[PDB]
Amino acid sequence: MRRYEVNIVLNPNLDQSQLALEKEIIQRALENYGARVEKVEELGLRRLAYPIAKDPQGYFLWYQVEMPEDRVNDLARELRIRDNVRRVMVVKSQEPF
Amino acid sequence: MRRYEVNIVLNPNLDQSQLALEKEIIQRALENYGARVEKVEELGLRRLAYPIAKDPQGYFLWYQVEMPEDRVNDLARELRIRDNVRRVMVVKSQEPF
Amino acid sequence: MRRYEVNIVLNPNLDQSQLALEKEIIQRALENYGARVEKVEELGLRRLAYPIAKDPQGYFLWYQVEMPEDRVNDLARELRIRDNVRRVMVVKSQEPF
Amino acid sequence: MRRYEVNIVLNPNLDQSQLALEKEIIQRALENYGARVEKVEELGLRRLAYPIAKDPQGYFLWYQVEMPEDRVNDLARELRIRDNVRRVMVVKSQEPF
């Protein structure tokens, strides 16, 4: 069990009930892959380093989790098949909250 | 004028009026070096990658600024002389809010 | 045209002619998406933050490129369909060589 | 004992015997603070995110070390008092060589 930071970029044009739904799917994918969610931050819109789906902005979500390292790559895969997930990046936690 | 992210780690044991005071000194140092403050986040306590002043935790503050690049190193210097500033790290902004 | 760093992790178990072949496909994908390759570094084996394809190590390649930002996401996609590419991560260059 | 990456930026205008001397002082400071040096890379000149000592470039050195975490901040301090060291940044190693 290792602590990771999961950085999710979502489609910037979702309304609030679409946004809450994507968040619920992300939490169930987290729980189903063995993750203990310790911190969630809703960061909001930011301009991307390069456009994704011809969109130069994205809605950012960050999570601090503790999960089995052998499951991380399958979780990142699962999260990437939702059409509204523009980018997933999981890094090892260096300075945990 | 370039956009930067300023990451400040403060002494974790300050009370709220000590904390508000350090924040005011940081804002005046920012304005005095030509910075336009666009975003401020108070992140809270986190465990450091290595202890500083035998303290393994720090109180984190993040700022998104736009300022003259020729002033950045003098600003980082100025911020580092307050006794309660444990660490200053300025990076170029990649995905601005 | 913006400068980016492309971080490629390859299968750690390739022999030298397999490795040179993957490198040639990566260069033609780079040229075909409008990239000017300015620097290439062959970093070697490193232990991954989490295992990918049940492999806890990967062979690292880094590139400093200048390319049209509107093409970056399609290039990352293209590079990810080679079976031996375990991970692609493109970030904006902050301190270019 | 924890594994760290030490990023040193030196004055870009040193000749080769000045450079070899700074490198020797850095290795003795490393050994004297309990560090096991596992990897050293001489990266060369890069343009800085912001100028330091009115210099917009620096000569980069990277080290992968294993050392006691309680000594890291004193080592960073020691390395920063050499006039030719423009910047020291120590981060926890995530994907070690």
Q: Is A24 exposed, middle or buried, given 0-12, 13-18 or 19+ CB atoms closer than 10 A?
A: exposed
Number of domains into which chain D is organized: 1
Cα dihedral value C14, C20, C22, C26, nearest 10: 150
Best CA proximity match to C74, nearest among A90, A81, A54:
A54
For residue C16, count other CB atoms closer than 10 A to its CB.
7
Q: How far apart are the C-alpha atoms of D59 and D52, rounded to whole Å?
A: 12
Q: What is the extent of the structural domain holding C73? A: 1-97
Q: Does D28 touch chain A (CB under 8 A)?
A: no
Q: How far apart are the C-alpha atoms of B56 and B48, rounded to whole Å?
A: 6
Q: Does C49 touch chain D (CB under 8 A)?
A: yes
- Taking a C-beta distance cutoff of 8 angstroms, is the pair D56, D87 a contact? no
**Angle C72-79/C16-32 helices, nearest 10 degrees?**
160
- For an interface test with C, the pick among D9, D46, D86 (most C C-beta atoms closer than 10 Å) comes out as D46
Q: Does C44 touch chain D (CB under 8 A)?
A: yes
β A36-52/A55-67 pair status: antiparallel
CB contact under 8 A, A48 and B96: no
Q: What is the resolution of this structure in A?
A: 2.0
Nearest neighbour of A73 by CB, restricted to C2, C52, C69: C52
DSSP summary character for residue A70: G
CATH number at B73 reads: 3.30.70.60
C94 chain-B contacts, CB cut-off 8 A: 91-92, 94
C15: enclosing H helix or E strand: none
Q: How far apart are the C-alpha atoms of B59 and B84, rounded to whole Å?
A: 10
Q: How far apart are the C-alpha atoms of A8 and A26, rounded to whole Å?
A: 9
CA A59 to chain CA mean position, Å: 10
The region that residue C21 occupies, defined by phi over 0 for left and psi between -120 and 50 for alpha, beta otherwise, is alpha
CA distance B94 to chain C (A): 7
Nearest neighbour of A48 by CB, restricted to B43, B45, B95: B95
Experimental technique of record: X-ray
Q: How far apart are the C-alpha atoms of D92 and C67, rounded to whole Å?
A: 31
